[PDB]
Amino acid sequence: GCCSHPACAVDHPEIC
Amino acid sequence: GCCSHPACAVDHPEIC
Amino acid sequence: GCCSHPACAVDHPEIC
Amino acid sequence: GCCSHPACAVDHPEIC
Amino acid sequence: GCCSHPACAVDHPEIC
Amino acid sequence: SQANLMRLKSDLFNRSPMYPGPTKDDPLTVTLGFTLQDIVKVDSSTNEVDLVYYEQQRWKLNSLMWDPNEYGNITDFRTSAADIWTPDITAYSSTRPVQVLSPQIAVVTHDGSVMFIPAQRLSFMCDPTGVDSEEGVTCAVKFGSWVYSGFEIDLKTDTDQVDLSSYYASSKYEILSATQTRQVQHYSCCPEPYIDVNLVVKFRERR
Amino acid sequence: SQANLMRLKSDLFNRSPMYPGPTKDDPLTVTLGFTLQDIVKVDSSTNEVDLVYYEQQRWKLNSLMWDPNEYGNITDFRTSAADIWTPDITAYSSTRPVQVLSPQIAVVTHDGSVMFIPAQRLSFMCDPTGVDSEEGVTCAVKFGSWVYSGFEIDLKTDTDQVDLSSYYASSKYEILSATQTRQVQHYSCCPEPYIDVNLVVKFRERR
Amino acid sequence: SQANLMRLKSDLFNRSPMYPGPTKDDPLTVTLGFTLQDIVKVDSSTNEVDLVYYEQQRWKLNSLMWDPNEYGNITDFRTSAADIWTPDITAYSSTRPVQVLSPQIAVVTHDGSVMFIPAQRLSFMCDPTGVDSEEGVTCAVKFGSWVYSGFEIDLKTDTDQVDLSSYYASSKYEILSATQTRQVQHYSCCPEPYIDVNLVVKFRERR
Amino acid sequence: SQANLMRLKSDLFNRSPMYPGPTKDDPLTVTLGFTLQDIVKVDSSTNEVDLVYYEQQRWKLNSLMWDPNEYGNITDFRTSAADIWTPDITAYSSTRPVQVLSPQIAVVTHDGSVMFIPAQRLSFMCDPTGVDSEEGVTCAVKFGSWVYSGFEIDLKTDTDQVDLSSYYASSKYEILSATQTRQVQHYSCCPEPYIDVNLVVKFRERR
Amino acid sequence: SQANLMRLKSDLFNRSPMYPGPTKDDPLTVTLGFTLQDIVKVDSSTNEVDLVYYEQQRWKLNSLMWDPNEYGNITDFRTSAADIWTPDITAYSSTRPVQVLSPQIAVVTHDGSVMFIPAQRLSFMCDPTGVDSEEGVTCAVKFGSWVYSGFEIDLKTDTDQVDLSSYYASSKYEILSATQTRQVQHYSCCPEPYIDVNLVVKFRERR
């Protein structure tokens, strides 16, 4: 559920 | 007249 | 048509 | 008086 | 009751 | 050739002074066209109505000409309109400051031509009474230069029909007609033409 | 051609320091004129009323003089109002910050005269009770300098009648009269004249 | 070592001119994905709906490459979104200019990668009538470039499912479905693709 | 003449470093005085009331001194308040950001003293219950420095009576009393004075 | 001695490149604390609640250290928060952009720690249903970095009780509890801690 919180999406273009 | 439309008033301080 | 969506009209002043 | 209008009040810091 | 008024809080990081 | 476009933008913008505006011996022609997108709100308590439209403006500066061969055969480019001079074209009966809804980015061609289409939301003076009707109401707003007369800036329309092909299908108001008529005003006082484009729209709520 | 106007603009704005404002020993007189365009909204729960008008401001600066011989016979030009010093004529009983509806571009002519016409929307203190009636109500708002006395800024009106020839015909309020009266006020404490222009307008809703 | 990163920020941004935008001889691909957060307000008298959402956009540009061991192993960093070129993804049926709820900070990677996720609240055209039924309403607003065609900016969506895992649990509206589908458009006049991504959402009041 | 004032503006503003603010070893005293102009709006559903007032502030800086004989007998001048350091007197119980109603233009004298009178509209916390009564409500808001304590900024009032002599005669509320008192505050923990000015105003409708 | 603080301000801000933000190799710890002042407005038609609070944020940086003996025994100073790098804490469920109620001025001490307390008004998602029961309602907002994960910015609260000793006695809603609890959240995909401080407030209309 990473792609819903922006601090996560930016650290992981690998996934999101 | 002329003195009601500012594009006219500035070109004619003689008048407005 | 084209002249209704601005990304089209700027690429075609020929028409719009 | 004078101290109620700002254009007057700054000219007279003596009073206002 | 210093820590609720920001002028007091900044002078005193020890406490607030 | 990204280098080549770096080079042309740099030869046209930090090189020469700001173009200082049209004058009477080097006049200029601004072409206007409106595509109307929605009547969002009418207000019966103030007689002001709110529009969303794209205002397409076009002109041509010799100060922006260039030869494509000298700049890698390139023919146009995009720039923030803040990098370029823009015309003075204002709504004459506006009732609050306009809201720009889109980026403001111009297109320039090697011809020296500029196109610029900001989307705007405008409130303007208009009595709505009769919008509840079959017959509808008619509103008008004029656009024109605010400091230049007809002797330095000319206005022109490519067509008299406002483009409605992107108007909101579920608006609260139907459009019965929409016109772009440019008009001339002379006065007794003075030779000079005073030029405007008159936006005329007849509309109705939905039955 | 354009070179000549780039050249005179460059000699007037890049060379000299900024004009530092009028003093007792070199004062200045500003002439005011209002063109009233619509009484937009009245609010009985707070007694504030909203106006849209043109304010014609005009003054003369020696530092903006120039000789046309030197500049290809050029006699006037338009420029951004940010490029020149402008007066601090401000509404004295406004209730919100004023909204500019137009470009702010002044015209400068070789004698050093500048005319400047911002279209504005203003909220100011006015009790409306009685707008219903056939008498109408009367509102007044004074304009004047906010820091300069009469010894440094003089105000002057060319007419006492507010120009109503472009009032929105189908507004929500009928204009019955509109005057721009110039007023001087002294105080006991103090030598200085204090000058303001009193805009008084009498109006009622349509019927 | 902050030193190693300050040196790389200076070597990418200070002494080369800013990237001049996509061209046709080097186009670019922007990927959009919406995390929808709340249907805040619906207005039946104007047919406008207000959305609060995160718009995550990602594109790629050569002017941002470096290899990490030449700057002490760094492969990503964050910078102000103003320090770098951004695409001009704008809603096409917006009615008020967007307000950002979030900081505008991008993260950029050694391969040249930028990702940027602004939170925004958007007003856009949508007819709500029928929202308080069990069926619901559907609204659509498309996003896309405002000045570039498909030959210069192409859009991709990573999924067709907008992320609903962060919708406000106690909102005033259920969401039934919500899509981010890419659409391409030709016109007869013209070869070029015009590409946008359409956000479609089906929602209803909360029983 | 003006040459002499341009020269005095130049010798004070670019040729010196920014004033860094008062310290403990050089405290500073700003004197406050309020002239209340109108209670515009009461909001009983939220307990916030909106004021229009003049805030007259005055302080003395040694960095603004000059000898009149060396600048053509000039003894005072005005400059935009952006050109000089200003104190950080803030409303403590405000609920919106204040709106500036006037130009912000200060007067500074050869003494190094500065007077600055911005007109503001402020919304702040107040329970209006009891206004419809004949004894009315009384509201209060405190002003003071927001980061400096009493040891660096002291506040002072020249009088404890708020100046009402230009209160709007046909406003929606009347004032029974209006006082501006300085307050000292010590805490259990701490050495420093905490200084504020408490303006408490007692008001009622018009019946 | 102000010469000594101008010299120190000039040496910390003019000499050096701006701190480029925290990294995984050199992380940073921000301490947050909320002082709650008023629940100003709730509306059940949109489930938005408006708070006015001071959020005290505090962090320490090596690049802002200085030795007092090399600067005339100076220990701390005030600077506008624009002069320094500031963190990215942001409300995660905001609905309109926050309104700053206070000056934005930080104070920095010789160890390099900086404290900064902006007063704010925030609208955020909260369903008020039950506010005039007695059980009251509970609302929550999380704040955190908008881009930096736990490995680069840590959050920490010195107390878990939101400071109410300055809550408006006569507001129209009243706080039953108010807590600032720090939370960490991991997800499977990803090593990194993602951390927030969660503001929970329980409130009710006047009994």
Side-chain angles (χ1 to χ4, degrees), chain C residues 3-5, chain F residues 33-40 49-56 120-122 124 139 141 143 161-169 171 173-180 199-203, chain H residues 92 125:
Chain C
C3 303
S4 314
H5 312 65
Chain F
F34 294 79
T35 86
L36 176 58
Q37 209 198 334
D38 189 33
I39 310 204
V40 314
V49 63
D50 294 26
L51 256 56
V52 171
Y53 59 94
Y54 318 152
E55 160 164 15
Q56 161 172 354
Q120 297 171 77
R121 183 214 178 106
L122 175 85
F124 63 87
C139 292
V141 293
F143 301 80
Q161 283 302 316
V162 174
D163 185 79
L164 301 161
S165 329
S166 308
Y167 190 106
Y168 181 37
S171 169
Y173 312 91
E174 311 164 10
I175 297 319
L176 306 163
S177 211
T179 330
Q180 315 190 290
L199 183 67
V200 156
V201 187
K202 191 167 162 187
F203 67 102
Chain H
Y92 282 40
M125 316 192 277

Side-chain angles (χ1 to χ4, degrees), chain G residues 36 160-164 175-180 199-202:
Chain G
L36 183 154
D160 286 300
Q161 274 101 305
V162 200
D163 188 350
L164 310 164
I175 294 309
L176 312 165
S177 76
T179 84
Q180 48 196 36
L199 180 62
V200 188
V201 308
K202 194 159 164 184

Side-chain angles (χ1 to χ4, degrees), chain B residues 1-2 4-12 14-15, chain F residues 92 145-149 152 185 187 189-190 192 194:
Chain B
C2 178
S4 42
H5 309 162
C8 203
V10 288
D11 264 331
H12 305 264
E14 47 193 329
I15 287 189
Chain F
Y92 282 157
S145 181
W146 182 264
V147 293
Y148 293 107
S149 75
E152 310 107 22
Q185 275 288 330
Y187 305 94
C189 132
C190 16
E192 316 82 290
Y194 285 81

Side-chain angles (χ1 to χ4, degrees), chain F residues 7-124:
Chain F
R7 177 183 107 201
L8 166 60
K9 289 187 104 272
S10 175
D11 284 342
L12 288 189
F13 292 152
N14 32 348
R15 149 95 176 84
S16 203
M18 195 45 104
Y19 164 96
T23 53
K24 302 166 282 147
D25 213 308
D26 317 83
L28 163 73
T29 315
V30 192
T31 302
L32 284 100
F34 294 79
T35 86
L36 176 58
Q37 209 198 334
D38 189 33
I39 310 204
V40 314
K41 160 171 73 185
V42 313
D43 183 325
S44 324
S45 70
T46 55
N47 302 144
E48 58 191 326
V49 63
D50 294 26
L51 256 56
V52 171
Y53 59 94
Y54 318 152
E55 160 164 15
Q56 161 172 354
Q57 327 170 321
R58 177 277 181 191
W59 66 95
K60 171 177 136 47
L61 291 208
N62 297 294
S63 118
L64 301 169
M65 298 186 136
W66 76 89
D67 173 353
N69 297 328
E70 299 194 71
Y71 289 78
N73 294 335
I74 72 100
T75 173
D76 50 33
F77 64 111
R78 282 90 164 112
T79 327
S80 266
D83 290 10
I84 193 190
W85 175 94
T86 83
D88 183 22
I89 310 296
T90 317
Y92 282 157
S93 54
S94 48
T95 181
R96 337 212 65 158
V98 77
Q99 288 174 155
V100 50
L101 297 163
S102 75
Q104 307 176 255
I105 299 152
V107 167
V108 188
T109 82
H110 70 76
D111 172 35
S113 282
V114 195
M115 294 233 314
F116 170 55
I117 310 178
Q120 297 171 77
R121 183 214 178 106
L122 175 85
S123 288
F124 63 87

Side-chain angles (χ1 to χ4, degrees), chain F residues 47 125-127, chain G residues 36-38 166-171 173 206:
Chain F
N47 302 144
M125 311 186 287
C126 174
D127 189 347
Chain G
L36 183 154
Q37 186 161 210
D38 189 13
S166 306
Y167 192 69
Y168 181 36
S170 35
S171 167
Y173 308 87
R206 293 206 142 272

